[PDB]
Subunit: 250 residues, 4 copies
């Protein structure tokens, strides 16, 4: 319904937030290609949402530049012209700036920053001037707004994603590309990422962190992405959309 | 559909943005009471959207404090317990801070600030702890983010609404009131308000103002309000939602 | 030294932050008039900093509009043309939006908002186009950035001051008035205001509030005001300056 | 005077903003080591400010990780324990996100992001827990707040610097390291960087960009850095300091 005729690429769409985004996208009429590095997890994820007439899994590392062009070619051949790109693939490292190894630093930014750049850049090139009502949704974080003492590299990547997206949004708007670029800034969401962050759920459920006294679910982010992907938000570009249970409000 | 069982008060719902919010709210299954100071315009506005089974007009000035209590009583009698409050009623004065008369200053703030406060305060008192999935949507502006040399009082009011709403959102969250509070920050939208601002449409359509090269329509704001009113945004509180064609992105 | 030839009005300069601003202003060569409602405290405050050749007390309520004109006339007669206005006079009420009486609401805003407006508006009219390197410094807060569940009216006032100042700054800049307008956003500072907020010092000293593990002192705000008052910041206008021990960084 | 006993490393201190920072730092009593890639420009710069008793040039690429440790060792041997680190070295590329080569992307981020990370990380390790009143000043930009259609990679780096610094500031504060971390966000400043951006000065001097109708000078940024380096700002950490002639205010 709300995403009629839309064709979406959702990176890291096999687990957590990305899975829910893909799930709700298909539910609203969109055709979706999800990516991930693990094929077994990926195929199970895709089949869990629907058949290959609406959703397909493509194994792809978001930091793999050459693979991005093939990903677009695959999606377009399968479903027609890509209209929506969700740069969701991302990882977290639990290290202060002081304690961050250069290897940790480079690896996180390769995925969280370079991966988003690859998708956004190619997304603009491929979707511009085609009357698709194209939408690029880049997954930032509340960590793109505020800092965390043990998420140094993570903070850097999300701050980068936040502002880089504004540049793309402006360029597309000024050149009448019919492409919108926005960022989503989830608070803490119950996902495998958060499960891997030791004690994060109990600590961030505290009122001093999340005022609602609990963390969110992947569907909380799926629904704001549906809005941004749909023509409902045709006047929304370059903006930041925060779903965080009040985290950044205090 | 998306607003099933919701009962909404939309202040200033007889023209422009408020009218579209009411229009789309009814479309998504909500019961709506719209307010305005002019009865002739108001009654015509309500009938243009639907019958009295889904929408009714109530004559009410948002700055009328005593009237707010009667408004809630009237809405509740007609449709049952209020679940949604859209503090949308607002006015603009085209004056620099330097050139603003104290009368202009007090009158704009009476409506834009005191009115939003009256609605938010009573909204919390009336909707808390009732499992309604209550949502309070306060209409700020891009003028709550950036200044304009000829919108002094307006800027003050929208900045106040922006941050006051965060206070309410936090209070409701920490006390488990089941009430969410968010602000919407429209860019320039084609409405009687903008029509009353001499030459505003052509000037704000310039790329140096709105990068998309045009201003928005009332439906652009209606749809984000639908999202905030719905249980889809159950994890969104204390946040700011900007639909401005890229105005604040540059 | 750093404020040579400057003539400053500092509202609420008899205690706390305002007192320190006046103290350091005089130290850096400026002539200062401090205001307050209590004459006994005020006269003692002025004499504690210096003689009437550098600082004088004038009894004046910031919400007294007519009194503002006489204040400027008095200051100018004593020290020559005013070059600097610090709208610092402000009060706090410890109430949620829900629990705020309309009387509390109107009174806080009368001082914190209308007072700042009166000073800013007249400040522009009186200091523009005189080559004074004029600076208007409006005292907002971290509560102009984030909300607090028990500072509803306060949050509104500080958000208003934050954005209204931008309007004034832009107007002055575009019209080449040689007047700059900026806002200062202190975190929690050890003052009679904070002392009047029951238990505020111990609670806001907690790491979850102020990361430095303590609140600030009035001199912390004095020194950033000295910078904004001086010609050192001749390229700074419409901006927000935060001294909060990291409060808003998390 | 204001920087008594301070020992500063200023990366890219041989031209533009960095040169002025070094100049004013020495003027205020600090000992300074400036870096740059070109030795001839570097030595001329250092000698132009003072003798080797107050300032020395060290040839160093900010993206050279191993060189950073030697830089700290050199500075400390020459002047005693480092107290201040100004991560100022940075470059700009005039390309939209769409038109940005991966090489351009990687090279800019290597300097503007990785360089700042190297300096901040080592800065914390070397200056913590020594009672130095240590200050880390990371040079972001207005391009870390808003986007520009032809500064894609640049926007990314400055957004990254903006938020990464907050993480460091929090960690240092919570662990009582006696190290502060803040970001400076200059508007357009007359420097060789801006001269290399074709037509940037005339375009950004337009009122629609910089409201003051002109761009700034390197000293405008030097003076805010002096404040941040001095003990005057001992309560300021994790914050953003904007000197932009009103650019981001509209
Ligand atoms: N969960 C939160 O609290 C939260 C909060 C704010 C922002 N975010 C952001 O939302 C995004 C998703 O978060 P999440 O919690 O859902 O993470 P997640 O649960 O761990 O799932 C991440 C997904 O991305 C895939 N992936 C991981 N690395 C990849 C790579 N290099 N290339 C392609 N795909 C990759 C993963 O599959 P494979 O491992 O098999 O590759 C997985 O399907 C992230 O960008 C995150 O930064 C999350
Ligand atoms: N249009 C924009 O570009 C724009 C941009 C950002 C934010 N906003 C905000 O969005 C809100 C609505 O904007 P708008 O453009 O649609 O305004 P509008 O076209 O002029 O319509 C305002 C509506 O509010 C009613 N109203 C006016 N004063 C009232 C009062 N004291 N009490 C109750 N109702 C009142 C009006 O009806 P009556 O006159 O009969 O009372 C009218 O129905 C405003 O708060 C505005 O500040 C608008
Ligand atoms: N202290 C903090 O933690 C903090 C944090 C952020 C922002 N601020 C802001 O910084 C400003 C000063 O704070 P503060 O802590 O130093 O307050 P304070 O300790 O209570 O002192 C307030 C000063 O203003 C005067 N004053 C009060 N009401 C006035 C009025 N109507 N007209 C003129 N003068 C008046 C008071 O003298 P009289 O009573 O005799 O009139 C007093 O000298 C305030 O605007 C506050 O909102 C403070
Ligand atoms: N100018 C503006 O309008 C403006 C506005 C906002 C932010 N900023 C930021 O302020 C900082 C300085 O700006 P600027 O205008 O003064 O630039 P600039 O005039 O071109 O000077 C940059 C200085 O850094 C040195 N440098 C360049 N690349 C380096 C590297 N890889 N390693 C070490 N040193 C290096 C340069 O010397 P060598 O070439 O010999 O190496 C030069 O001395 C930058 O981070 C910039 O992003 C500038
Ligand atoms: Mg990199
Ligand atoms: Mg916070
Ligand atoms: Mg009033
Ligand atoms: Mg702007």
């Amino acid at each position: 319904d709300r995403l009629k005729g839309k064709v979406a690429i959702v990176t890291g769409g096999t687990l957590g937030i990305g899975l829910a985004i893909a799930d709700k996208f298909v539910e609203e009429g969109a055709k979706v290609v999800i990516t991930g590095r693990h094929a077994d997890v990926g195929e199970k994820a895709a089949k869990s949402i629907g058949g290959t007439d609406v959703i397909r899994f493509v194994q792809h590392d978001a930091s793999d530049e050459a693979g991005w062009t093939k990903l677009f070619d695959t999606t377009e051949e399968a479903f027609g012209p890509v209209t929506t790109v969700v740069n969701n693939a991302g990882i977290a490292v639990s290290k202060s700036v002081e304690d961050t190894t250069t290897e940790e630093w480079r690896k996180l930014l390769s995925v969280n920053l370079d991966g988003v750049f690859f998708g956004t850049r190619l997304g603009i090139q491929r979707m511009k001037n085609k009357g698709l009502g194209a939408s690029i949704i880049n997954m930032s974080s509340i960590e793109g707004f505020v800092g965390d003492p043990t998420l140094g590299a993570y903070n850097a990547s999300k701050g980068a994603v936040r502002i880089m997206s504004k540049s793309a949004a402006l360029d597309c708007a000024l050149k009448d590309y019919d492409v919108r670029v926005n960022t989503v800034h989830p608070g803490y969401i119950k996902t495998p990422l958060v499960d891997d962050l030791e004690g994060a759920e109990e600590m961030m459920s505290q009122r001093t962190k999340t005022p609602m006294g609990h963390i969110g679910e992947p569907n909380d982010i799926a629904w704001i992405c549906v809005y941004l992907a749909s023509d409902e938000s045709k006047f929304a570009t370059g903006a930041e959309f925060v779903v965080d249970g009040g985290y950044t409000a205090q």
